Design a protein around this nucleic acid. Sequence first.
RNA 1: UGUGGACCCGCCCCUUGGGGUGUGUCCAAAGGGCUUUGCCCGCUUCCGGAUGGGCCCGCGUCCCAUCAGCUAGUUGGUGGGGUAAUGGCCCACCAAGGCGACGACGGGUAGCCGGUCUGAGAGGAUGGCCGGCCACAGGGGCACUGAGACACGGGCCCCACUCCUACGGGAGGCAGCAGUUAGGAAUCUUCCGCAAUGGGCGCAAGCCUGACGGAGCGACGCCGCUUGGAGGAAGAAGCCCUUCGGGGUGUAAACUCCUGAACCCGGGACGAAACCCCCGACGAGGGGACUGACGGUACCGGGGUAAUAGCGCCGGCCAACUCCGUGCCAGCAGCCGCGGUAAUACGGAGGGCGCGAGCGUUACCCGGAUUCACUGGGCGUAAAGGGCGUGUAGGCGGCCUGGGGCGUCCCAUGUGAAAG
Lengths: 83, 104, 208, 124, 138, 99
Amino acid sequence: MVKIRLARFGSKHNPHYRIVVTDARRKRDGKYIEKIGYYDPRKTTPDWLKVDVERARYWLSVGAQPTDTARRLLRQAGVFRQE
Amino acid sequence: PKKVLTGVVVSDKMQKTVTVLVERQFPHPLYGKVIKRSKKYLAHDPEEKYKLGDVVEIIESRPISKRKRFRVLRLVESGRMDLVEKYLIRRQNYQSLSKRGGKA
Amino acid sequence: GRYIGPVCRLCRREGVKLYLKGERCYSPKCAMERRPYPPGQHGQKRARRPSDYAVRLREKQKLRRIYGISERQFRNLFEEASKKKGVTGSVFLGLLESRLDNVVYRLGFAVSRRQARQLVRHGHITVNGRRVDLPSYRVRPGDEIAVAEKSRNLELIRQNLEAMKGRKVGPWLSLDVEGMKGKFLRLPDREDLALPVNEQLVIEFYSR
Amino acid sequence: PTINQLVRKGREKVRKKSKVPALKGAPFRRGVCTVVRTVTPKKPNSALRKVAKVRLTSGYEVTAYIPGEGHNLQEHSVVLIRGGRVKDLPGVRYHIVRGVYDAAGVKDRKKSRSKYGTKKPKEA
Amino acid sequence: MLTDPIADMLTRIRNATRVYKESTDVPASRFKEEILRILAREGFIKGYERVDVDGKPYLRVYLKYGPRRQGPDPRPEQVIHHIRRISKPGRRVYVGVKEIPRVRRGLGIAILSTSKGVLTDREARKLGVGGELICEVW
Amino acid sequence: RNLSALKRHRQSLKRRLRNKAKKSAIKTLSKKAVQLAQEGKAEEALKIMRKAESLIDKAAKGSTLHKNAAARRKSRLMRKVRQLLEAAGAPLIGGGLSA
RNA sequence: UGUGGACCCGCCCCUUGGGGUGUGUCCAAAGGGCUUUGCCCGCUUCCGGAUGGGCCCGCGUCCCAUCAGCUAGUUGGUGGGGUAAUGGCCCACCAAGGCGACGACGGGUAGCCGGUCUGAGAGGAUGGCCGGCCACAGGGGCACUGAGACACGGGCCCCACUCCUACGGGAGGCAGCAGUUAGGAAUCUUCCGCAAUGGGCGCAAGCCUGACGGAGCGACGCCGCUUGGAGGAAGAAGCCCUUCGGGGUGUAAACUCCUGAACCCGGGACGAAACCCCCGACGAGGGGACUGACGGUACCGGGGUAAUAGCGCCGGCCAACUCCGUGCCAGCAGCCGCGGUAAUACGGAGGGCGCGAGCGUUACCCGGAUUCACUGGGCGUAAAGGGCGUGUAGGCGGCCUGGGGCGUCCCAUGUGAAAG
Ligand SMILES: [Mg+2]
Ligand SMILES: [Mg+2]
Ligand SMILES: [Mg+2]
Ligand SMILES: [Mg+2]
Ligand SMILES: [Mg+2]
Ligand SMILES: [Mg+2]
Ligand SMILES: [Mg+2]
Ligand SMILES: [Mg+2]
Ligand SMILES: [Mg+2]
Ligand SMILES: [Mg+2]
Ligand SMILES: [Mg+2]
Ligand SMILES: [Mg+2]
Ligand SMILES: [Mg+2]
Ligand SMILES: [Mg+2]
Ligand SMILES: [Mg+2]
Ligand SMILES: [Mg+2]
Ligand SMILES: [Mg+2]
Ligand SMILES: [Mg+2]
Ligand SMILES: [Mg+2]
Ligand SMILES: [Mg+2]
Ligand SMILES: [Mg+2]
Ligand SMILES: [Mg+2]
Ligand SMILES: [Mg+2]
Ligand SMILES: [Mg+2]
Ligand SMILES: [Mg+2]
Ligand SMILES: [Mg+2]
Ligand SMILES: [Mg+2]
Ligand SMILES: [Mg+2]
Ligand SMILES: [Mg+2]
Ligand SMILES: [Mg+2]
Ligand SMILES: [Mg+2]
Ligand SMILES: [Mg+2]
Ligand SMILES: [Mg+2]
Ligand SMILES: [Mg+2]
Ligand SMILES: [Mg+2]
Ligand SMILES: [Mg+2]
Ligand SMILES: [Mg+2]
Ligand SMILES: [Mg+2]
Ligand SMILES: [Mg+2]
Ligand SMILES: [Mg+2]
Ligand SMILES: [Mg+2]
Ligand SMILES: [Mg+2]
Ligand SMILES: [Mg+2]
Ligand SMILES: [Mg+2]
Ligand SMILES: [Mg+2]
Ligand SMILES: [Mg+2]
Ligand SMILES: [Mg+2]
Ligand SMILES: [Mg+2]
Ligand SMILES: [Mg+2]
Ligand SMILES: [Mg+2]
Ligand SMILES: [Mg+2]
Ligand SMILES: [Mg+2]
Ligand SMILES: [Mg+2]
Ligand SMILES: [Zn+2]
């Protein structure tokens, strides 16, 4: 099915992913459906994880299935927080 | 939108099918001059309602056969065989450039 | 490849007094003294009217020879000045003058440029706190270029900064002989620099 | 030409003829000798310019030139071709690379050593 | 029959001025008049008036020059140093508003024919329209 | 060598055979009906048409025919039978036919 | 069992096979696990979403006209077959057509694109790496199974080849990683890991993953850095030139002092927190647990030695000159041209210019080349007006008014992925 996962965009030893909705079958760094965020593991900048809970929610609602890591990053940004 | 084209009926020697010659003007990509250019589309005429010299609109249709992907939408103006004429003559001199003896 | 060879030999073939030696070059013995003619068996013979070309080839060699930089780098900097908005000369010179090794020489932590370049390579220099051992490091407006803390006690740094007491500094720079700090106030304007070169000819040489 | 004419025939992109069919126009081509005769210069000159007949791997049998003070090429000497005519020997368009294969490099050569394939002299 | 009446008029004028005529005549047509109305307003000519010669409608164009110069060849400078035809039959030219050329760094003009009528490269730019680039004058 | 993807082949053949059989039936009974009707056999004609209709919809139950392939089948049948009984038929069993 | 859906037919709304309705006929299913008497994982039919895809259409897409006519499933019907689906896709029968100088047919060459390189631009050239699409998986054909394949590590047949052959008969397909061999001027390690990202399967634990994340090799490219710094003679020795007084290499060195690449010692990563588990509802939310290939690597701190230089050129174009040797020789040579005795041109030397871990050569692309000229060229004598005419297609059209508004112009909007 469609998915919300990471796409490796950094450089060697400088990983910077790109939280994105893609089809389960495409490449990793292949052609995605829509970008919905980004993530810097090495947290080198105060801004190392943006998400856009709105869009993230749009896709979850229509079928997108998130990777384990992606779900983690989405939660950190409170995609599923209902309180 | 299903593309709509306008041309002249240059032939109806077919059963429920008319040859529509459509023209097109435009600037030359490098030389600027506005040049002409044409193409014939095989239109669908179930009730063989249209004849030579009819100017008809053609509409992008769902396949009727090979060559046939268009149906005759309606009539624009009728009876102008003056156009058919050209198409015919352009064909006239055609069969006069080879090894037939120069007899044209 | 930073040359690493006879330098007063370049002032001679340049006809102009290049101070790429720091001390000595400021005292009657600059080699330019008693030999204002190029180095070589034919040095003294009468020169032939240089070709429009030479005049520019030399002029660029002069400017570049000053900041002791490779042609590779020199060009890439010039090209960067070609893309930026503004008088390519004013930007080119401003950009050459932003080099950390150059700034160091300016703030007088070093008598020459090649001495400064080493004071950079050996961590004796600091930019806004952290050290920087890259001569090519670009100092933007507002940076504090200091002397490495664990280095302030070096005999070469003592007499060098001591001789800076009382000495004025470029207007675009700020010096504090006490703490051995410095301040890159702003990119120098053409006016501020008094170089023995007409960059105009340079912009022309790379325009072939 | 009128615009109509240009529109009609357009201009013609004339092509370029390769002055070195070292096939695949590759940088160099390997070959074995066949003759090592000498040749005589064109109009303005005279001397004994050295030439070798090479039967190339590219399936081409062509005349190469042997640059340098003196050589050591014989009948079945495999050599490397590099292209570069000799303005005094018509028909001699390729040069032979000294220092490669059976082509020894010019001995006792201090100057343009890079060409003529000669190692750095061990000046003690 | 003239193949290009507009290129003709532009020339009758180009020609007339090199021999410093007082005025030249060109057969009349609205379009041609509209063009003159510009040379007139832009100050390239003293003006034009409609006349008749042997019964046919023409456009007397009164030309303009400079002051008699000093030295050999005291012939006056030209007001119209240049007047060249562009869009022509056999090679029409049309420009978009963002493409109307700027003649002689501004010192000259360009006459387009738009659906908002005949205009100069400024007039048209201002009205925000482009069209057929008739000619270029300076 | 060795690759237990052979199991897939091994299986496809049992499938290939199961499918082949359900169709043979359909075709065989489909004609049967297009025949009795052809001859105007009002009752027995429709009758069979009904069983055919069934094995058809049934084939589609799993992956033999499936899709609107079964649907075509049925259509061509109920169609042909109704038009062949157009020779004094008068549908009796009124199988898959609307008044 | 029939929520429903499929099909025939009828009627209604739509309007090419869309939606609704009525009669008739036809069509459902699978169980499993426990925190076992209800939760979970499944199952069935139907409607919808989402993602992926098929098919069709306008326009664009190299060279030769020393290729000018091509075609019979050919073109179009009717009916049928087939498919998820239109369609000569296939078939039977009928009609006689279709296509071409706005270049058919034939021949040559070629995967297309985002882009790349180059150009003031217009344009020329190109499509490697990365992304998109397509095609192929020793050569040809074919279908089976499946939501999907005509299926690179699935199947069948023919062919070529290679290993087994108790000669009847079999077994194979690196254009997956790595590697071998051959061809070539030339292109890498039979690497470490599944830690991370991603994928398959599983409730899960977890398994698989030469996708991938890393290391290795090669100045192949780009960027950074080093081979030292400051002081040191009106100036060593050596080599060089010498109008023999001198002049050059040169502050260069020697030498004094100073910093201190390499290298030694100590510490030592980020990339990893989820999945899981407990509280809470197997939710939101909170709590804890395990998990680094790279790697003891980066980076930090301490100690600490003066510690690689090369290649091209020096006649004009083009930056840099002298001596010696050689003598149309040997040789140089991008073009123009140098050598038959005092060669700035060969070879060497001292000197010098250029660039520097590189420098030079060969090949190839754009430029300069307005030297195919659209921007931006020409034809009296430089290359170039057709031996002349008639006129076919085509290109081009005088003055005024009206309609239309195809060209043209304007506005808004959609599109124009990411990378670049
Ligand atoms: Mg060459
Ligand atoms: Mg094997
Ligand atoms: Mg049977
Ligand atoms: Mg029911
Ligand atoms: Mg109905
Ligand atoms: Mg309808
Ligand atoms: Mg019903
Ligand atoms: Mg149970
Ligand atoms: Mg025919
Ligand atoms: Mg059908
Ligand atoms: Mg049919
Ligand atoms: Mg037939
Ligand atoms: Mg062809
Ligand atoms: Mg190919
Ligand atoms: Mg150009
Ligand atoms: Mg560019
Ligand atoms: Mg371009
Ligand atoms: Mg392109
Ligand atoms: Mg690609
Ligand atoms: Mg495909
Ligand atoms: Mg193979
Ligand atoms: Mg199937
Ligand atoms: Mg394989
Ligand atoms: Mg080999
Ligand atoms: Mg993994
Ligand atoms: Mg995983
Ligand atoms: Mg020194
Ligand atoms: Mg020490
Ligand atoms: Mg795990
Ligand atoms: Mg619980
Ligand atoms: Mg939780
Ligand atoms: Mg220390
Ligand atoms: Mg040393
Ligand atoms: Mg010179
Ligand atoms: Mg000799
Ligand atoms: Mg040489
Ligand atoms: Mg002589
Ligand atoms: Mg030379
Ligand atoms: Mg010499
Ligand atoms: Mg240029
Ligand atoms: Mg050109
Ligand atoms: Mg010319
Ligand atoms: Mg002549
Ligand atoms: Mg001539
Ligand atoms: Mg004539
Ligand atoms: Mg002639
Ligand atoms: Mg003739
Ligand atoms: Mg006309
Ligand atoms: Mg007209
Ligand atoms: Mg009108
Ligand atoms: Mg319009
Ligand atoms: Mg947009
Ligand atoms: Mg983009
Ligand atoms: Zn000096």
